[PDB]
């Protein structure tokens, strides 16, 4: 039980919290949206020819 | 405290009214506060300062890990397993970071609601507005992926959404 | 750091120390109950300090101290809410528990497992504090189920008695029915609002929909024993009298009202749920009071009284006065606990007799018990300037000055009259007249534990209403303008009930005997609700669980379709295949048929 | 991963080279040490699995299952050494060999990278189990039970094999990493419908799903104590683990093929929970509670959401521990009165006070008292089901009410009331039985403080 | 006297060494999957002036 | 504490007290071993009332099958002693 309690953070939870804090700070100062609707950039996406 | 960044966890400047007694009766809260400070807080600070002197004698650091940016799933070929693997790992890390961003915004919202008292409905408009936008973006990005999610399914969802947006924009231009 | 958070946390933390000593060499000593009682008294004294801080500056706080786990965007952490409700209810519960433990040191003196009894009482108090101070719904559910399990273990304390076990399982059943609504509210709030914590729920629900509030109302009806799920509270008197005084009268049974009070910002916005709550409270407060006036066991009368007061609290919630309902909770605790203590004193002094028909003239035989019970009944009846008066009389006016269901208003007034009626019944049949108990008199109330424990609650029953009412900030708009006949209505109907009940009780001295009315049978047998609802649904469910679920489906048809059909078919095919007599004349002719078929069926089309 | 497998394999020659009176001590000590070594697999990553080699890998779903599997062997050895006292030395060693082989097969089953190897080990687990049931069971029904256990499973898994070698012929591989990355949607066709059924029914029979759950009340009841412990705690979870693993290839076909199974699970939950109310056999009541609990895992896996998968993992682990404890608790009374009738021995709280406390705690965890992980898994599945459809709350709510009813009933019948007068051979509890109960219950409570260790790869 | 202990307690070292051997067999396995050691786009790194491999 | 350790003499005293308070039976004639029918000329209905009076005196209920047989004060005393586990 002691060994399991002190297992190192290989799940990267504190790391994710730190990264999230960094981006929230950066985006707020910039005035950019806190979160982006599209994860992948539109420029690198090639949609089919036309809507019909 | 210097533990956390005050720009990412803000709070108002904490206006506290000065004590303005009107009666001549003794204040029991003041007597109890003096007793608490003399009997509880002082030994606690003494023990803490001893612990801090012991800590200062040994100093070591741990480093936040920095990860390089790798190509995403859009640049990967159909059956190139190694680029797919790296893109998927990066996508999973970005998903975790986005979860924690939503967590930070939710903590701001909760703290505002508790702090503002009976005027929370008006004094927490900014926090509610920030949470609404972040929630909408997170829902657009990861909602309905289900168990067995991946970067490929997220890309397909985004492509479907862009096709819907393009059709809706073409419909409006014909009016 | 200001001492508010530290003191509020330490108050609850020190209550757990005697539980950690349950394996020490104090738990096998006869000083353990006194140790537990002393710990609870010290906890009460410590909890008095944050209450002073709140009365001074209105200080409130939430403490999220331990992060338990994080699921995606949802974070669940151990958080305590230390608002007005928490810091006001904690000292009242600790005061009542201190009195009841001192009382139990005397009432349960000859029990071989009194140490276990004290730890069990302590365990319940811990779970109730967890319920009351919870800031998220998961911690609230932890306390919610903890108090139910402790109630199960304390109702069936005498586990060799079949009726006590039946009552304990009845309590569990009736509370699981409302646990359904609790879980429905949790699921709705998690999906729709993405949080279990109170602050987020308040932000994201400006106009709350029906379904979560209906779930909360079902949970409250289950916990507080309202009309649909009422019968478990009267049956919970199978437990020892201190258990009735602590759990089922003043502290545990108010958890549903407390739940609806904690969610009053959302209930302010839904009119349908307020109407449902008001109607449920009204029918409860009338039905239980109507049942009370013809009961003969004294504990049953007090149990129906507390069920009717819970109905009144629910009515107060239904007219959008949550702070008035909380105030009535705090007031009712004092005199209801002390009434149960006086009943226990009578029962012990009469060799474990609980029927009022065998209690005669105790007015002069137990003078202190008489004084305490008279003062408690006067406090319960809304006598002016007593503890009961500073809440109940304000409730009756509030219903009179509101856009209210007319039937609910009429039911509340009639129930107010019946309260005085059954208080009269208790006093008349227990303390007036001539002795009706056995001739070997054992009456003795000169134990300092009993006297001190009752006196401490007696002082509260007199002064707590005025002390508390004048120190809480105004949390509503008062009703400064009333018609005179509407200001005095509570007293008028209480006095009318007093006079009518006293006259009908004096009628019993006459030398006439007549058979009872059908209305009396309806009242005395509890509307026949237990006689019907504990026999028809249980019988049908338990009959279907065997006739069809076990026998028809599991033992017969599920066997018949998959394994028995397969075994029968394979057995038949095996018998057909293997029953050849061994005559070569038969199967060489078979060979000829086979050869001919092969030449034409597979050979004539290649 | 061989650092767990090879020590487990060394338990066989160690058992066979031990003294006649030292086999239990050696086996218990070294299986406990193997559990200690297995605890290292709980250190999991947040993004991908622990890929030890081309053959074996560990994930956040299989690591708690492995830990429970290794932890169960010492408890089985402790529970078995009482009723096997009069047995000969070689047959005792054969029984311990059966248990060791079962553990070895399960450990490799939970970590196999390729689905055919997983299938071979998941089917190999049948032989030791059947031998245990049909050689060391106590009654004449144990033979029939064995047949029911053997043919229900195989009739389900024989199509699965045919599906698996079919899939490898079209996608090229059965490696789970490749299967997950190169995943493609399932079209809506009759061939795909039957491929979906062949990939699912094998796991459904193992759960088991209401309707094909008949083998379980026979096999668990007639088995010896270690047989029923391993059948309830680990062997039922093979179906859940396999369904969770194989669901990736199934989409989007699962959205409409899951309806009959969701209906069967959501109604059979009520059916089996109500069956528990009228059950004269205590061990049979405990067995039926398992079907009622696994219906919920089936629902959670079919609806395919992160909250449902987390809940299903937590519930599988919690049910393993609780059902094993309940079977042991019933066996303690059976070894006294030699009958499984629930009303034969009553009022036992008077005669066995601490075993009554064990009974109470086991019953409390069975009805998912908060904050136990039983409740965590149940509530997560209920929330996900509510998202899937609000009306589910009615069925889910009803099941909770019934589960508490037959649990406490089981408690009131055996512990409360008055002890039967004729029985006079009720000896005080042994230290072995008390420790066996404690080693079941303490890890369960300890898992409340760190629930992320049992919430699977979706946490 | 050493035989009076060893000859009836040597079965007590089968599982320990079986553990040790197991660990060894893992390490050798790691030596067959080094085709991308210090070659991934995420962890590619210039070697320290003395180190030879980024991991064993 | 609770009720004192009631003894055999106390049971006999209370039984005879209750009997002597019955108008039908005179005090001088009544004896511990007196039969309620042969000695006192009492009917079956009368006997039932004595049993009920004993129940009211000692605060416990005697079953009808057990109650009918009791025809002497000594029998009642022995029954009560057997129920309350009185050995002196
Ligand atoms: C101020 C402004 C307003 C002024 C209002 C006007 C002034 C007051 C008006 C009169 C109020 C009532 C006063 C007397 C109450 C009755 C007491 C009595 O003597 O009972 C006699 C008799 C029972 O006596 P018993 O059986 O001979 O008793 C044997 C021994 O005494 C057994 O002895 P025991 O030891 O068992 O004792 C029995 C017990 C009592 O025995 C009983 O159990 C019966 C008592 C019932 C009383 C019920 C009163 C309230 C009922 C509300 C019900 C709501 C509607 C429900 C309708 C359900 C329909 C299904 O005795 C008591 O403990 C005391 C009784 C209570 C006395 C005080 C009552 C105060 C509250 C009522 C007055 C409220 C005044 C304030 C109003 C202000 C409003 C603004 O019951 C009745 O006959 C009348 C009961 C009242 C309702 C009856 C209605 C008829 C029912 C059927 C109707 C037809 C239905 C057709 C089908 C429809 C289907 C849709
Ligand atoms: C789709 C195309 C068409 C469908 C084809 C598939 C259907 C095949 C049907 C097979 C039926 C035979 C077994 C079932 C009943 C048992 C026989 C019996 O006697 O009981 C009769 C039973 C009542 O009789 P019973 O007197 O009460 O019997 C009392 C005892 O229980 C029974 O008395 P017992 O125990 O004393 O039995 C006497 C004896 C008698 O055993 C037999 O009856 C032998 C029957 C097997 C011949 C297979 C015929 C199938 C031909 C398909 C070709 C398609 C052409 C177009 O039993 C044996 O000794 C058998 C032991 C094993 C020896 C195996 C020797 C046969 C060779 C294997 C098959 C031969 C394949 C051909 C060449 C192969 C060379 C490479 O019910 C009947 O009367 C029904 C008779 C025939 C019904 C067939 C239904 C077919 C309907 C066609 C629908 C077409 C829809 C349109 C399509 C578009
Ligand atoms: C809130 C409490 C604060 C606790 C402070 C720390 C205490 C740590 C204890 C941990 C549990 C120990 C393991 C259980 C087996 C005990 C072994 C034993 O046989 O002892 C005999 C030993 C010697 O007695 P004996 O005279 O030989 O007994 C003869 C007969 O057996 C006669 O025996 P008996 O009639 O005395 O029976 C034993 C006794 C006690 O035995 C037990 O029931 C132990 C199991 C408790 C129920 C667990 C199953 C239900 C599902 C919930 C699981 C929650 C797990 C939490 C994490 C646990 C981590 C270890 O039975 C009961 O008192 C009623 C049990 C029902 C409890 C109802 C309340 C449930 C919810 C409570 C809140 C849980 C979360 C707290 C935090 C919330 C936010 C602040 O007795 C003791 O030493 C006392 C037993 C311990 C009672 C603790 C009750 C509260 C436990 C709460 C969970 C742990 C929380 C710790 C963190 C702070 C909170
Ligand atoms: C008999 C008398 C009874 C009463 C008297 C007893 C006296 C009191 C003793 C009870 C203590 C009460 C517990 C109070 C909680 C404090 C403990 C808590 O702090 O520890 C937790 C830690 O608990 C562990 O995480 C959980 C232990 C894991 C359990 C594994 C069981 C061992 C294996 C057995 C095999 C079973 C199979 C299981 C299958 C999966 C916190 O987790 P975490 O928030 O991180 O810690 C933060 C700091 N860290 C991260 C740096 C460490
Ligand atoms: C007791 C425990 C047993 C285990 C339970 C297992 C349950 C298995 C059930 C399988 C789920 C669905 C199977 C196939 C999907 C639809 C079936 C049919 O009813 O629906 C219609 C199917 O159409 C017709 O109804 C054909 C089916 C009729 C003939 C089949 C007989 C079914 C009767 C029930 C048998 C009992 C099943 C269990 C046997 C033991 C759909 O309309 P249609 O648009 O046209 O077809 C679209 C499907 N496409 C895309 C593949 C083309
Ligand atoms: C015993 C006496 C000890 C005397 C010396 C100790 C004095 C102070 C010690 C300070 C230790 C440092 C410390 O605790 O820091 C916080 C440290 C780590 O931070 P986390 O919040 O866990 O991070 C997230 C991981 N989940 O937390 C801890 O380890 C202490 C936690 C104890 C909490 C108090 C007890 C409550 C838990 C009871 C169990 C309840 C079950 C689950 C409840 C669910 C509630 C929603
Ligand atoms: C077309 C061919 C169909 C082939 C499918 C085979 C199905 C697999 C089950 C085969 C088992 C056959 C057993 C049998 O029939 O024996 C009958 C037997 C006669 O007794 P004896 O065994 O000879 O010994 C005692 C009497 N002196 O009766 C019994 O006792 C039966 C006991 C065993 C029954 C267990 C069967 C469980 C099957 C459950 C359903 C699955 C069946 C397999 C197909 C499933 C559907 C695809
Ligand atoms: C304990 C009882 C459990 C019972 C489990 C049995 C049900 C298993 C499900 C069916 C098993 C056979 C499926 C075959 C494996 C699928 C592989 C596949 O995809 O092949 C299909 C072919 O699918 C089939 O042929 C299957 C048809 C059925 C054959 C055997 C009939 C078995 C009975 C069917 C109904 C029973 C299934 C549900 C019963 C549930 C249990 C009661 C398409 O391949 P192609 O031919 O190449 O098509 C593309 C190019 N033309
Ligand atoms: C609240 C209460 C409800 C009201 C209850 C209604 C009950 C009815 C009231 C009237 C009672 C009857 O009819 S009275 C029953 C009618 N029939 C007879 O009485 C038959 C003759 N009885 C004998 O001969 C016996 O000797 C015997 C008399 C028993 C004496 O026996 P001892 O002397 O040898 O003990």
DSSP structure string for C357-425: GG----TTTSHHHHHHHHHHHHHHTT-TTSTTTTTHHHHHHHHHTSS--HHHHHHHHHHHHHHHHHHHH
Ligand showing the shortest atom-to-Cα distance for residue D324: 4
Which residues 25-54 of D have a C-beta within 8 angstroms of A? 39, 42-47
Distance between CA atoms of D329 and D332, rounded to whole angstroms? Answer: 5
Most A CBs within 10 A among B64, B93, B101, hence the mutation to make, goes to B101
Nearest CA to ligand 7 atom 16: C567
Q: Which candidate, C247, C374, C237, C381, places its Cα nearest to that of C308?
A: C381
End-to-end alpha carbon distance in chain B: 58
Nearest CA to ligand 4 atom 22: A5
Q: Which candidate, C277, C11, C215, C214, places its Cα nearest to that of C128?
A: C11
**Among B84, B89, B96, whose Cβ lies nearest the Cβ of D48?**
B89
Beta bridge partners of D51: D57
Q: Which helix (H) or strand (E) element contains residue D101?
A: helix D89-111
Under DSSP, is residue C62 helix (H, G, I), strand (E, B) or coil? strand
What is the SS3 assignment for chain B? CCCCCCCCCCCCCCCCCCCCCCCCCCCHHHHHHHHHHHHHHHHHHHHHHHHHHHHHCCCCCCCCCCCCCCCCHHHCCCCCHHHHHHHHHHHHHHHHHHHHHHHHHHHHHHHHHHHHHHHHHHHCHHHHHHHHHHHHHHHHHHCCCCCCCCHHHHHHHHHHHHHHHHHHHHHHHCC
Under DSSP, is residue C64 helix (H, G, I), strand (E, B) or coil? strand
The answer, for A5 touching chain B at a CB cutoff of 8 Å, is no
CB count in 10 Å sphere of residue B41? 15
Q: Which candidate, D348, D362, D340, D335, places its Cα nearest to that of D437?
A: D362
Beta bridge partners of D58: D50
Longest dimension (CA), chain C: 119
* Whole-number CA gyration radius for chain F: 13
Distance between CA atoms of D24 and D78, rounded to whole angstroms? Answer: 8
For residue C127, which residues of chain D lie inside 8 Å, CB to CB? none
Indicate the DSSP class of residue C474: P
Helix ranges (DSSP H) in C507-583: 518-524, 529-533, 536-546, 558-559, 565-578
Q: Which candidate, D437, D459, D220, places its Cα nearest to that of D325?
A: D437
**Among C7, C73, C199, whose Cβ lies nearest the Cβ of B114?**
C199
Contact between C285 and C313 (Cβ < 8 Å): no
Q: Quote the ligand 1 centre to A23 CA distance (angstroms).
A: 73
Ligand 2 proximity of C597 Cβ (cutoff 6 Å): yes
Q: Which candidate, D269, D153, D283, D157, places its Cα nearest to that of D218?
A: D283
Q: How far is CA D143 from the centre of its chain?
A: 22
Indicate the DSSP class of residue F26: -
Q: Quote the ligand 1 centre to C79 CA distance (angstroms).
A: 50
Is F56 labeled as catalytic in the residue annotation? no
The answer, for E33 touching chain D at a CB cutoff of 8 Å, is yes
> Rounded to 5 degrees, what are φ and ψ at D173?
-150, 160
CB within 8 Å of D111: residues ≥ 6 apart = D1, D52, D56, D57, D58, D62, D66
C-alpha count within 13 angstroms, C-beta hemisphere, residue D52: 21
Indicate the DSSP class of residue D428: P
Contact between D356 and D279 (Cβ < 8 Å): no
The residue with tokens 């009107």 is: B22
Nearest-CA distance from E49 to chain D in Å? Answer: 30
CA distance to C313, C337, C383, C462, C500, per residue, from C379 (Å): 16, 12, 6, 8, 19
Domains of chain F: 8-84 (1.10.1200.10)
Nearest-CA distance from D320 to chain C in Å? Answer: 22
CA E1, E7, E12, E17 torsion: positive or negative? positive
Token readout for A41 is 């950039």
> Rounded to 5 degrees, what are φ and ψ at C68?
-70, -50
Q: Which candidate, C536, D134, D48, C59, places its Cα nearest to that of B29?
A: C59
**Among C149, C188, C191, whose Cβ lies nearest the Cβ of D369?**
C149
CB count in 10 Å sphere of residue D296? 25
* Chains in contact with E, counting 3 or more C-beta pairs less than 8 Å apart as contact: B, D
Distance between CA atoms of B175 and B165, rounded to whole angstroms? Answer: 16
CB within 8 Å of C207: residues ≥ 6 apart = C269, C270
C-alpha count within 13 angstroms, C-beta hemisphere, residue C131: 28
Q: Which helix (H) or strand (E) element contains residue C75?
A: strand C74-81
CA distance to C346, C465, D164, per residue, from C369 (Å): 8, 22, 82
Of C570, C574, C577, C578, which is best to mutate to test ligand 7, by the most ligand atoms within 8 angstroms of its C-beta? Answer: C570
Which residues have CB under 6 Å of ligand 5?
A: D 188-190, 193, 211-212, 257, 260
Nearest-CA distance from D309 to chain B in Å? Answer: 7
Contact between C100 and C154 (Cβ < 8 Å): no
CA distance to B8, C69, C500, per residue, from C77 (Å): 20, 7, 56
Residues in chain A: 52
Q: Quote the ligand 2 centre to C541 CA distance (angstroms).
A: 49
Distance between CA atoms of C261 and C277, rounded to whole angstroms? Answer: 12
Environment class of C145 (CB within 10 Å of its CB; exposed 0-12, middle 13-18, buried 19+): buried
Ligand 1 proximity of C495 Cβ (cutoff 6 Å): no
Q: Quote the ligand 3 centre to D442 CA distance (angstroms).
A: 11
Distance between CA atoms of D298 and D242, rounded to whole angstroms? Answer: 12
Measured from the Cα of D147, ligand 7's closest atom is: 35
Ligand showing the shortest atom-to-Cα distance for residue D149: 7
Q: Which candidate, B87, B162, C76, places its Cα nearest to that of D459?
A: C76
Beta bridge partners of A46: none
B101–A17 C-beta distance less than 8 A: no
Q: Quote the ligand 2 centre to C593 CA distance (angstroms).
A: 14
The answer, for C78 touching chain D at a CB cutoff of 8 Å, is no
Q: Which helix (H) or strand (E) element contains residue C76?
A: strand C74-81
**In Å, what resolution does this model reach?**
2.6
- Spell out the domain ranges in chain E: 1-56
> One of F13, F26, F43, F66 is an active-site residue; which one?
F43
Distance between CA atoms of B167 and B165, rounded to whole angstroms? Answer: 5
D46–A11 C-beta distance less than 8 A: yes
CA distance to A4, C603, D38, E15, per residue, from D33 (Å): 16, 69, 9, 9
CB within 8 Å of D138: residues ≥ 6 apart = D222, D224
């Amino acid at each position: 039980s002691t060994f399991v309690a002190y297992l190192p953070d290989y799940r990267m939870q504190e790391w994710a919290r730190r990264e999230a804090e960094r981006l929230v700070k950066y985006r707020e100062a910039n005035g950019l949206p806190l979160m982006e609707s599209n994860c992948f950039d539109p420029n690198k996406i090639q949609l089919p020819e036309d809507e019909d | 405290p210097d533990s956390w960044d005050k720009d990412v966890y803000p709070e108002p400047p904490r206006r506290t009214p000065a004590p303005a007694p009107q009666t001549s009766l003794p204040n029991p809260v003041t007597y109890l506060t003096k007793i608490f400070d003399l009997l509880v807080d002082r030994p606690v600070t003494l023990a803490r300062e001893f612990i801090e002197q012991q800590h200062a004698k040994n100093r070591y650091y741990y480093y936040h890990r920095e990860f390089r940016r790798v190509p995403d799933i859009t640049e990967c070929e159909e059956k190139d397993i190694l680029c797919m693997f790296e893109a998927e790992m990066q996508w999973r890390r970005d998903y975790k970071v986005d979860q924690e961003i939503v967590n930070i915004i939710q903590e701001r919202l909760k703290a505002c609601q508790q702090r503002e008292g009976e005027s929370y409905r008006q004094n927490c408009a900014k926090e509610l507005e920030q949470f609404t936008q972040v929630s909408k973006a997170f829902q657009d990005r990861y909602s309905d992926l289900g168990a067995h999610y991946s970067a490929r399914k997220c890309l397909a969802k985004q492509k479907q959404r862009m096709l819907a947006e393009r059709k809706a924009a073409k419909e409006a231009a014909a009016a | 750091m200001n001492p508010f958070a530290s003191l509020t946390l330490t108050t609850l933390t020190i209550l757990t120390i005697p539980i950690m000593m349950s394996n020490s060499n104090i738990y096998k000593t006869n000083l353990y109950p006194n140790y537990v009682k002393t710990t609870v008294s010290y906890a009460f004294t410590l909890s008095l300090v944050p209450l002073l801080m709140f009365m001074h500056t209105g200080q409130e706080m939430i403490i999220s101290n331990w992060h338990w786990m994080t699921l995606q965007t949802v974070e669940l952490s151990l958080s305590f809410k230390m608002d007005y409700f928490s810091v006001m209810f904690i000292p009242v519960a600790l005061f009542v528990t201190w009195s009841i433990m001192e009382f139990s040191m005397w009432y349960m003196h000859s029990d071989p497992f009194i140490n276990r009894f004290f730890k069990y009482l302590l365990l319940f108090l811990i779970t109730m504090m967890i319920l009351v101070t919870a800031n998220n719904l998961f911690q609230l559910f932890i306390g919610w189920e903890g108090v139910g399990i402790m109630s199960f273990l304390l109702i069936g304390w005498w586990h060799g008695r079949t009726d006590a076990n039946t009552a304990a399982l009845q309590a569990i059943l009736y509370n699981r029915i409302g646990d359904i609504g609790f879980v429905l509210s949790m699921a709705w709030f998690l999906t729709h609002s993405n949080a279990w914590d109170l602050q987020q729920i308040f932000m994201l629900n400006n106009e709350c929909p029906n379904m979560p509030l209906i779930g909360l109302l079902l949970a409250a009806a289950g916990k507080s024993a309202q009309f649909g799920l009422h019968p478990w509270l009267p049956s919970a008197m199978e437990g020892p009298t201190p258990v009735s005084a602590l759990l089922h009268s003043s502290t545990m049974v108010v958890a549903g009202v407390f739940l609806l009070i904690r969610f009053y910002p959302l209930m302010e916005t839904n009119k349908l749920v307020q109407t449902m709550t008001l109607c449920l409270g009204a029918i409860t407060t009338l039905f239980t009071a109507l049942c009370a006036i013809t009961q003969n066991d004294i504990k049953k009368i007090v149990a129906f009284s507390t069920s009717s007061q819970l109905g009144l609290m629910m009515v107060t919630i239904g007219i959008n006065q949550p702070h008035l309902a909380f105030l009535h909770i705090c007031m009712h605790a004092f005199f209801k606990a002390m009434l149960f203590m006086c009943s226990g004193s009578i029962i012990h002094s009469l060799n474990d007799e609980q029927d009022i028909r065998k209690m005669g003239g105790l007015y002069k035989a137990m003078p202190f018990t008489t004084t305490a019970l008279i003062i408690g009944s006067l406090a319960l009846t809304g006598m002016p300037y007593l503890t009961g008066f500073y809440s109940k009389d304000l409730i009756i006016e509030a219903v009179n000055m509101s856009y209210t269901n007319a039937w609910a208003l009429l039911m509340t007034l009639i129930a107010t009259s019946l309260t005085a009626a059954y208080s009269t019944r208790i006093i008349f049949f227990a303390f007036l007249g001539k002795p009706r108990f056995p001739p070997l008199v054992l009456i003795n109330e000169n134990n300092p534990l009993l006297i001190n424990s009752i006196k401490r609650l007696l002082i509260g029953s007199i002064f707590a209403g005025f002390i508390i009412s004048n120190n809480i900030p105004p949390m509503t708009v008062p009703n400064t303008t009333m018609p005179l006949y509407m200001k005095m209505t509570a007293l008028i109907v209480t006095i009318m009930g007093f006079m009518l009940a006293l006259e009908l009780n004096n009628t019993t001295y006459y030398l006439k005997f007549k058979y009872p009315s059908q209305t009396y049978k309806f009242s005395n047998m509890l509307g026949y609700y237990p006689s019907i609802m504990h026999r028809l649904p249980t019988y049908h469910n338990l009959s279907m669980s065997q006739k069809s679920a076990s026998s028809l489906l599991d033992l017969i048809w599920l066997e018949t379709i998959l394994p028995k059909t397969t075994s029968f078919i394979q057995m038949k095919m095996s018998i057909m295949v293997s029953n050849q007599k061994g005559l070569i004349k038969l199967y060489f002719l078979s060979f000829l048929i086979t050869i001919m078929i092969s030449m034409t069926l597979f050979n004539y089309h290649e | 991963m061989l650092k767990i497998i090879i020590p487990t394999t060394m338990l066989l020659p160690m058992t066979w080279m031990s003294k006649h009176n030292m086999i239990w001590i050696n086996a218990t000590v070294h299986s406990l040490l193997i559990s200690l070594i297995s605890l290292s697999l709980l250190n999991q990553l947040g993004e991908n699995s622990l890929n030890f080699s081309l053959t074996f890998f560990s994930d956040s779903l299989s690591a708690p299952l492995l830990v429970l599997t290794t932890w169960l062997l010492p408890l089985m050895l402790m529970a078995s050494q009482s009723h096997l006292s009069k047995e000969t030395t070689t047959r005792k060693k054969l029984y311990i060999t059966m248990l060791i082989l079962l553990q070895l097969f399960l450990i490799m089953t939970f970590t196999a990278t390729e689905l055919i190897l997983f299938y071979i080990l998941f089917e190999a687990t049948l032989v030791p189990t059947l031998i245990i049931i049909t050689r060391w069971g106590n009654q004449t029904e144990r033979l029939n039970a064995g047949l029911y256990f053997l043919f229900y499973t195989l009739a389900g898994s024989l199509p699965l094999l045919v599906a698996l070698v079919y899939i490898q012929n079209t996608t090229g591989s059965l490696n789970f990493l490749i299967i997950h990355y190169w995943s493609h949607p399932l079209s809506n066709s009759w061939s795909n419908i039957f491929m979906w059924l062949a990939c699912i029914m094998a796991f459904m029979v193992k759960m088991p799903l209401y309707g094909l759950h008949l083998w379980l009340p026979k096999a668990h009841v007639e088995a010896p104590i270690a047989g029923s412990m391993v059948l309830a705690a680990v062997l039922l979870k093979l179906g859940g683990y396999g369904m969770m693993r194989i669901t990736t290839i199934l989409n989007p076909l699962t959205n409409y093929m899951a309806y009959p199974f969701l209906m069967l699970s959501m109604w059979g939950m009520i059916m089996t929970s109500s069956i528990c109310l009228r059950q004269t056999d205590l061990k049979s009541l405990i067995a039926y509670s398992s079907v009622s609990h696994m219906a919920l895992v089936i629902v959670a896996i079919m609806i395919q959401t992160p909250w449902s998968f987390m809940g299903a993992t937590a519930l599988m682990i919690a049910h393993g521990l609780t059902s094993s404890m309940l079977f042991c608790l019933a066996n303690t009374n059976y070894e006294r009165v030699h009958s499984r009738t629930m009303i034969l021995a009553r009022g036992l709280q008077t005669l066995l006070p601490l075993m009554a406390t064990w009974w109470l705690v086991a019953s409390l965890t069975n009805l998912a008292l908060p904050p136990s992980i039983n409740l965590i898994g149940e509530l997560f599945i209920i929330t996900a089901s509510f998202s899937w459809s609000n009306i589910t709350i009615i069925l889910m709510g009803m099941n909770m009410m019934i589960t508490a009813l037959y649990s406490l009933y089981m408690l009131i019948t055996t512990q409360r009331g008055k002890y039967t007068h004729h029985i006079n051979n009720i000896k005080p509890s042994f230290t072995r039985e008390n420790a066996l109960m404690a080693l079941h219950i303490l890890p369960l409570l300890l898992l409340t403080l760190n629930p992320k260790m049992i919430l699977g790869p979706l946490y | 006297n050493v035989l009076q202990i060893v000859r009836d307690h040597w079965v007590h070292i089968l599982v320990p060494v079986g553990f040790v051997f197991g660990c060894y067999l893992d390490r050798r396995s790691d030596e067959k999957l080094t085709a991308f050691r210090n070659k991934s786009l995420l962890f590619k790194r210039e070697l320290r002036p003395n180190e030879e491999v980024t991991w064993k | 504490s609770d009720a004192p350790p009631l003894t055999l003499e106390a049971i006999k005293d209370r039984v005879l007290y209750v009997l002597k308070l019955y108008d039908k039976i005179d005090p001088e004639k009544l004896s511990v071993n007196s039969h309620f029918m042969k000695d006192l000329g009492l009917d079956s209905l009368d006997q039932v009332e004595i049993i009920m009076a004993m129940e009211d005196e000692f605060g416990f209920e005697i079953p009808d099958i057990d109650a009918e047989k009791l025809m002497c004060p000594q029998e009642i005393v022995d029954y009560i002693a057997d129920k309350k586990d009185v050995y002196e």
